[PDB]
Design a protein around this ligand. Sequence first.
Ligand code: Y1D
Length: 119
Amino acid sequence: YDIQAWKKQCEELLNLIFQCEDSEPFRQPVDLLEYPDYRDIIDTPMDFATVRETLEAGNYESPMELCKDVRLIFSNSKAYTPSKRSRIYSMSLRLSAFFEEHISSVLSDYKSALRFHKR
Ligand SMILES: O=C(Nc1ccc(F)cc1F)N1CCN(C(=O)c2ccco2)CC1
């Protein structure tokens, strides 16, 4: 029922994501010279370095907020891809599956801890 435990659990999961070769395209913001039309398609860029820095700054209140930003990385890739058979989109789908498999317990434990706190 530790309502702070999610933060280190998220740090550790980001560390695992950074070790995954599938995270390579998502570790830093998209560059607007290599993909010059990116901001015509994507309103809110997001990447894993920005997620880690937001966490480490103490600017997430909950793991749900972190989860929303990570899911934005993946929805941006799906929106920008020219094909469902894209290399970088295909990497995003594997990485999303990995993320979702690991974040589920972090969310459940946090929400349970908070329900206990407010019992
Ligand atoms: O090259 C990058 N990011 C990047 C990373 C580090 C850098 F230094 C410079 C970069 F531009 N892509 C990431 C995700 N990508 C897609 O989601 C997508 C789907 C189909 C085709 O691209 C858009 C472009």
